[PDB]
Scaffold this active site. Structure first.
Site, mmCIF file in Angstrom:
data_model
loop_
_atom_site.group_PDB
_atom_site.id
_atom_site.type_symbol
_atom_site.label_atom_id
_atom_site.label_comp_id
_atom_site.label_asym_id
_atom_site.label_seq_id
_atom_site.Cartn_x
_atom_site.Cartn_y
_atom_site.Cartn_z
ATOM 1 N N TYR A 54 -0.178 7.890 30.724
ATOM 2 C CA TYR A 54 -1.469 7.322 30.215
ATOM 3 C C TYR A 54 -2.264 8.652 29.484
ATOM 4 O O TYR A 54 -2.354 9.721 30.059
ATOM 5 C CB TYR A 54 -2.283 6.976 31.369
ATOM 6 C CG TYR A 54 -2.860 5.520 31.288
ATOM 7 C CD1 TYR A 54 -3.567 5.127 30.453
ATOM 8 C CD2 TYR A 54 -2.051 4.744 32.069
ATOM 9 C CE1 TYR A 54 -3.727 3.516 30.167
ATOM 10 C CE2 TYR A 54 -2.280 3.105 32.133
ATOM 11 C CZ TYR A 54 -3.167 2.854 31.001
ATOM 12 O OH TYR A 54 -3.202 1.506 31.090
ATOM 13 N N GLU A 56 -5.365 8.035 27.333
ATOM 14 C CA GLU A 56 -6.723 7.621 26.647
ATOM 15 C C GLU A 56 -7.294 8.931 25.702
ATOM 16 O O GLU A 56 -7.295 10.109 26.553
ATOM 17 C CB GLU A 56 -7.489 6.989 27.663
ATOM 18 C CG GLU A 56 -6.939 5.607 28.112
ATOM 19 C CD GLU A 56 -7.678 5.153 29.429
ATOM 20 O OE1 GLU A 56 -8.003 4.099 29.294
ATOM 21 O OE2 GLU A 56 -7.402 6.060 30.287
ATOM 22 N N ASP A 209 -4.053 -2.986 2.842
ATOM 23 C CA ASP A 209 -3.202 -3.371 3.744
ATOM 24 C C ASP A 209 -2.023 -3.225 3.117
ATOM 25 O O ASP A 209 -1.331 -4.243 2.708
ATOM 26 C CB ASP A 209 -3.847 -4.468 4.357
ATOM 27 C CG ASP A 209 -2.827 -5.037 5.430
ATOM 28 O OD1 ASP A 209 -1.920 -4.308 5.809
ATOM 29 O OD2 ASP A 209 -3.310 -5.926 6.316
ATOM 30 N N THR A 235 1.501 -1.278 8.902
ATOM 31 C CA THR A 235 2.551 -1.295 9.993
ATOM 32 C C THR A 235 3.580 -0.246 9.867
ATOM 33 O O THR A 235 3.531 0.353 8.783
ATOM 34 C CB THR A 235 3.583 -2.781 10.099
ATOM 35 O OG1 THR A 235 3.849 -2.730 8.663
ATOM 36 C CG2 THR A 235 2.627 -3.949 10.222
ATOM 37 N N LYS A 238 8.838 -2.933 9.230
ATOM 38 C CA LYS A 238 8.916 -3.358 7.819
ATOM 39 C C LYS A 238 9.720 -2.508 7.133
ATOM 40 O O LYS A 238 10.655 -1.769 7.483
ATOM 41 C CB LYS A 238 7.662 -3.943 7.312
ATOM 42 C CG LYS A 238 6.873 -4.928 8.267
ATOM 43 C CD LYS A 238 5.734 -5.722 7.595
ATOM 44 C CE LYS A 238 4.952 -6.640 8.355
ATOM 45 N NZ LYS A 238 3.966 -7.101 7.882
ATOM 46 N N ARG A 244 7.717 -1.093 16.019
ATOM 47 C CA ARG A 244 6.531 -1.950 15.643
ATOM 48 C C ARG A 244 5.047 -1.114 16.466
ATOM 49 O O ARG A 244 5.206 -0.760 17.463
ATOM 50 C CB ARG A 244 6.467 -3.156 16.631
ATOM 51 C CG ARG A 244 7.474 -3.983 15.795
ATOM 52 C CD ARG A 244 7.623 -5.250 16.556
ATOM 53 N NE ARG A 244 8.631 -6.085 15.725
ATOM 54 C CZ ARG A 244 8.346 -6.854 14.816
ATOM 55 N NH1 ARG A 244 7.312 -7.454 14.179
ATOM 56 N NH2 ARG A 244 9.499 -7.194 14.148
HETATM 57 C C1 LIG Z 1 -5.565 0.084 32.929
HETATM 58 C C2 LIG Z 1 -6.508 -1.294 32.963
HETATM 59 C C3 LIG Z 1 -6.733 -2.052 31.544
HETATM 60 C C4 LIG Z 1 -6.115 -1.796 30.428
HETATM 61 O O1 LIG Z 1 -4.677 -1.210 30.067
HETATM 62 P P1 LIG Z 1 -4.145 -0.660 28.572
HETATM 63 O O2 LIG Z 1 -2.782 -0.938 28.774
HETATM 64 O O3 LIG Z 1 -4.632 0.708 28.779
HETATM 65 O O4 LIG Z 1 -4.895 -1.486 27.613
HETATM 66 C C5 LIG Z 1 -7.426 -2.974 31.804
HETATM 67 N N1 LIG Z 1 -8.043 -3.555 33.044
HETATM 68 C C6 LIG Z 1 -7.868 -2.762 34.317
HETATM 69 C C7 LIG Z 1 -8.313 -3.074 35.568
HETATM 70 C C8 LIG Z 1 -7.178 -1.571 34.116
HETATM 71 O O5 LIG Z 1 -6.852 -0.777 35.250
HETATM 72 C C1 LIG Z 2 2.890 -7.875 8.919
HETATM 73 C C2 LIG Z 2 1.462 -7.604 8.345
HETATM 74 C C3 LIG Z 2 0.481 -7.238 9.249
HETATM 75 C C4 LIG Z 2 0.447 -7.393 10.889
HETATM 76 O O1 LIG Z 2 1.540 -6.772 11.431
HETATM 77 P P1 LIG Z 2 1.825 -7.180 13.328
HETATM 78 O O2 LIG Z 2 2.558 -5.863 13.581
HETATM 79 O O3 LIG Z 2 2.691 -8.299 12.970
HETATM 80 O O4 LIG Z 2 0.537 -7.513 13.539
HETATM 81 C C5 LIG Z 2 -0.952 -7.092 8.448
HETATM 82 N N1 LIG Z 2 -1.245 -7.324 7.329
HETATM 83 C C6 LIG Z 2 0.028 -7.471 6.501
HETATM 84 C C7 LIG Z 2 -0.204 -7.397 4.837
HETATM 85 C C8 LIG Z 2 1.299 -7.558 7.004
HETATM 86 O O5 LIG Z 2 2.179 -7.607 6.167
#
Ligand SMILES: *Cc1c(COP(=O)(O)O)cnc(C)c1O
Ligand SMILES: *Cc1c(COP(=O)(O)O)cnc(C)c1O
Ligand SMILES: Nc1nc(=O)c2c(CCc3ccc(C(=O)N[C@@H](/C=C/C(=O)O)C(=O)O)cc3)c[nH]c2[nH]1
Ligand SMILES: [Ca+2]
Lengths: 453, 454
Positions: A54, A56, A209, A235, A238, A244
């Site tokens: 973690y 953040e 984008d 992204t 691709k 990803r």
């Molecule tokens: C840690 C936590 C999240 C968010 O998790 P992420 O993977 O950091 O987005 C949401 N809700 C609760 C209660 C959490 O402890």
């Molecule tokens: C693929 C793509 C996204 C979103 O990517 P994800 O990882 O699937 O959310 C956004 N914008 C464009 C133009 C894309 O080709």
């Protein structure tokens, strides 16, 4: 229990699934333009102990302690991101935490706009992305259309190109705060200079984008949206060929300063996301380093040549291409003049281990069954396919289409067509023959990744 | 170029860093209650060819072809999730695509609410999450608060518990559409029966965000939010010990005339908010969900409770006050004000001796800017085969940190003075460097889930 046992030992049912997916990828001809094959090196970072941390916040500015190494990784990912796209760090910064491309776009919007502010993007059936605003006549579909107010812009159906004149006209009336230049199903280069002029005139931010084309941009084989855009999302999968994940690049310094940096970073965290996926960030750093090399320029050149070769090969066999050709990594085939549609072709090709996408053609509705087919070079080019190999891919596609045509003259509806390919033994055998030939051809090519998973 | 070269051969700089982080995790005492150590089995899935597949949509209703195997993996991950929390397939469904905990919450809100509809969640310094709604007095902080209208409920500052009285009173006035039962820094069980009473009266939806305690709920070592809530969200990491991802569980079938959560929840995840699923994550989650169904995991979780108990009882028995007096879960909230210190000071001391814990605002905090507490968690070190005596010895190491912290507080003025004095003063340096060496030597000897070297 140590949690040091192998996957094949501890979860044989899952291990058998990974192996089946690995075989499918090895034996298939992957023509989905948004697909690629991630390197082993990147995947080793992706499935690593960096999952456990973690962190953040941002480097040097974390909530929790013990981030010395994770800070170095994120900072390194940042440097390699700027280096890959040849950006002066005095003029550009980059956020490496978005969980994917779609979160990268939502974070840009929440950073720069108020709820219900206006956005314009290429319409979804015209080749834009869901996250550029999409609502149908019936309802709001993208969260981009729920939290913000979108109006799409369109292709000129005569040319299959973005109608920059109608954008200019229509943006004057709608007065967007943000216009998005970027595409999912477009064979041509975007006139970013023209987009910029329209944005300057109506006082809107320009977002590029570049998800589909980012690797081509990195390799400098096509013009860079960074010359004209305020903000660039992408992204990391691709054409960049990473894990990803997502990236947000933004201008910084003097335009009177730019004020994107703090807003973009705040929107990603704390506004939208929780803990960074440091394992993904590391994998992305690995791919970004790969993207700075001669090897990757040569890859990206080859992607363009292969798409050209596929386009030429299709023309010679009498196919129509939307916009008449390609300047990038994909081609758009219009199957209506051939007497078949995309939904039929797509399903036939799928049964012979060729994965392509149906694609709406200009002029038809988001309702009528799509008359086109999208085909992409990046994935197969990663498997060392060259121009002659793509000519051979087109041979196989043509047989697919021809089978498709014969099944169409014996069937009525779309669901007739789909279960006739399964039931009718004469057509199911002709497909079995083609599948086996496709897979023999595809299996001989190298595949990035691990051998067995 | 094949893309089959090793990370150590092709990117030596990155490989170095993976090894330094693997080393850092091995030699440290990980007391952050959100951390855990993921199994090698799950990491092997996470770093797999499943990264390569675009599979937008849902099993059998994909937009692209070639998803036959990925469909089975998603379906398997679903069934394993339902089985891990002992839920009937007729009465519950689950969405396994959320990219993390925060996305899972945002997707519920966008699924069930209109923009600017009202939400209530435990205030952030009272132990709630950002994603439950959090604005300061200056500005809106969580996206939860920008796109929806949040009002925070609070702790009773006498008992350190959730003031279920004030929440029922204040929710009659605010009229929330959604109340969230969930915490990031709360040592006690939540009265989900009571939360659902308040939600029934004011006609709100009850969301249980069990991220922090999901392992404990799967193991059945605490009672389940699924008896009272209609929506449950979780991380797949933390006490479930999986890869970073998230889940959304939701009720389905007949209500009293069906529930209508499923279709709205799935649509909100895709196409509204997310793009391509992270199938490699989905598979790693499935592995970890299998691990959570087993007797091994029940024992892991019982040991989590006992180790927090033992950390608590040990802290009390060295003259430390604790928020709410005890714990019924995986963590302990340590009020450092009645020992004449605070979170910011303790945390930075502990960090320099390879002990990682969190600053935590307590009810009795009389400043609002430097917190007066410390969150200490079991799950991580328990995954490394720690038992009660090992935690007593951790507490002993902490006590030495706190006492260097108390002994530097009396020799320093401000918080940035305090931080310099740790690094700068030679007698305090080598008292820390000694305490560090002993902590590391203690921590290294225990096993570590995952790969040996990265
Ligand atoms: C840690 C936590 C999240 C968010 O998790 P992420 O993977 O950091 O987005 C949401 N809700 C609760 C209660 C959490 O402890
Ligand atoms: C693929 C793509 C996204 C979103 O990517 P994800 O990882 O699937 O959310 C956004 N914008 C464009 C133009 C894309 O080709
Ligand atoms: N290039 C490209 N183009 C695409 O269109 C695409 C897609 C599908 C996008 C999409 C998803 C849902 C609806 C939608 O309308 N949702 C449902 C409606 C429900 C309702 O009205 O209640 C539906 O699918 O019917 C409409 C469009 C995935 N990947 C893509 N790539
Ligand atoms: Ca160029």
């Amino acid at each position: 229990w140590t949690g040091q046992e192998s996957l094949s030992d501890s979860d044989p049912e899952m291990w058998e699934l990974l192996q089946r997916e690995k075989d499918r990828q090895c034996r298939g001809l992957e023509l989905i333009a948004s697909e690629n094959f991630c390197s082993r090196a990147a995947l080793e970072a992706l499935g690593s102990c960096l999952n456990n941390k973690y962190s953040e916040g941002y480097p040097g500015k974390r909530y929790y302690g013990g981030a010395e190494v994770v800070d170095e990784i994120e900072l390194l990912c940042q440097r390699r991101a700027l280096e890959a796209f040849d950006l002066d760090p005095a003029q550009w910064g980059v956020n490496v935490q978005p969980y994917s491309g779609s979160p990268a776009n939502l974070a840009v919007y929440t950073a720069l706009l108020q709820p219900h502010d206006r956005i314009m993007g290429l319409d979804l059936p015209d080749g834009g992305h869901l996250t550029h605003g999409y609502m149908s006549d019936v309802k709001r579909i993208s969260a981009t259309s729920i939290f913000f107010e979108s109006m799409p812009y369109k292709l000129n159906p005569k040319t299959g190109l973005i109608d920059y004149n109608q954008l200019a006209l229509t943006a004057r009336l709608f007065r967007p705060r943000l216009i998005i230049a970027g595409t999912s199903a477009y064979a041509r280069l975007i006139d970013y200079a023209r987009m910029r002029e329209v944005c300057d005139e109506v006082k809107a931010h320009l977002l590029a984008d570049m998800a589909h084309i980012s690797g081509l941009v990195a390799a400098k084989v096509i013009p860079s949206p960074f010359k004209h855009a305020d903000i660039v999302t992408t992204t990391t999968h691709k054409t960049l060929r990473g894990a990803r994940s997502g990236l947000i690049f933004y201008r910084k310094g003097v335009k009177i300063p730019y004020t994107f940096e703090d807003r973009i970073n705040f929107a990603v965290f704390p506004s939208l996301q929780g803990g960074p996926h440091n394992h993904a960030i590391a994998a992305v750093a690995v791919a970004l380093k790969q993207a700075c090399t001669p090897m990757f320029r040569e890859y990206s050149l080859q992607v363009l040549k292969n798409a050209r070769a596929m386009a030429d090969a299709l023309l010679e066999r009498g196919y129509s291409l939307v916009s008449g050709g390609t300047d990038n990594h994909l081609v758009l085939v219009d199957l209506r003049p051939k007497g078949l549609d995309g939904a039929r072709a797509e399903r036939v090709l799928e049964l012979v281990s060729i994965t392509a996408n149906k694609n709406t053609c200009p002029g038809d509705r988001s309702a009528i069954t799509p008359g086109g087919l999208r085909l992409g070079a990046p994935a197969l080019t990663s498997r060392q396919f060259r121009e002659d190999d793509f000519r051979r891919v087109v041979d196989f596609i043509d047989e697919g289409v021809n089978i498709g045509l014969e099944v169409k003259s014996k069937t009525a509806k779309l669901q007739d067509f789909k279960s006739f390919l399964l039931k009718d033994s004469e057509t199911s055998q002709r497909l079995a023959n083609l599948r086996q030939r496709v897979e023999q051809f595809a299996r001989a090519f190298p595949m990035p990744g691990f051998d067995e998973h």
